[PDB]
């Protein structure tokens, strides 16, 4: 779901058409969509460097990457990279939609029970997502950075 389809669905539950309030919401969405496109390009530029800087800032040289931790094994480290990478990609999708419901329905459906059953720590994931938020806010800009951070904090709040 987009912001556009959210506006259309809200007007459809009302049963009326798209008059001036919904039209002004759509004009607002178009005006932010320009910088949203530019931020999508500059995020898809160096996603690997973003995940690398995030794990180097947060997860490395700790107890979980040491023997006796959740990220000790090589397959577990690769799953962490992929998981971190996914959070960046779906936060990019939710940024371009302007709507977090697609992000929620995609990952926050079952990731709580999955991280419960596998014994994955939640708070280390929250710290890693916050490190992704800082790295992307430093890389992209101020307002597109906080637009990215809204959905990244939505992910981090959904996991908690």
């Amino acid at each position: 779901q987009d912001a556009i389809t959210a506006v259309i669905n809200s007007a459809d539950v009302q049963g009326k058409y798209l008059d001036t309030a919904a039209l002004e919401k759509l004009k607002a969405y178009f005006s932010t969509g320009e910088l949203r496109v530019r931020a999508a390009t500059t995020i898809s530029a160096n996603a690997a460097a973003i995940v690398k800087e995030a794990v180097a800032k947060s997860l490395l040289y700790s107890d979980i990457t040491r023997p006796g931790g959740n990220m000790y094994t090589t397959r577990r480290y690769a799953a962490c990279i992929r998981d971190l990478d996914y959070y960046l990609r779906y936060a990019t999708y939710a940024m371009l939609a302007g709507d977090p419901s697609i992000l929620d329905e995609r990952v926050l459906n079952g990731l709580k029970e999955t991280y419960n059953s596998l014994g994955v720590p939640v708070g280390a994931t929250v710290q890693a997502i916050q490190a992704i938020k800082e790295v992307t806010a430093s890389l992209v800009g101020a307002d597109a950075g906080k637009e990215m951070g809204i959905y990244l904090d939505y992910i981090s709040s959904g996991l908690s």
Partner: protein, 65 residues
């Protein structure tokens, strides 16, 4: 959009020497489009359906699923 199903289907054919634990008892995520015919397959095989749950979707969504 995604259903969380849990059903058992017994064996009314000859008995199988493979363990087949999963076939007899399973829990899987099925999309909304395939769920009608997949349910109908369990309907055909005479198996009980124990637990149906909407995993992703919201009820009453007219647009955007």
């Amino acid at each position: 959009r995604l259903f969380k199903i849990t059903a058992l289907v017994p064996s009314l054919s000859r008995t199988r020497t493979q363990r087949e634990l999963q076939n007899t008892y399973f829990t899987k995520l099925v999309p909304y489009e395939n769920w009608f015919r997949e349910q109908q397959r369990i309907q055909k095989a005479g198996g009980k359906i124990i637990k149906v749950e909407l995993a992703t979707g919201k009820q009453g969504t007219n647009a955007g699923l």
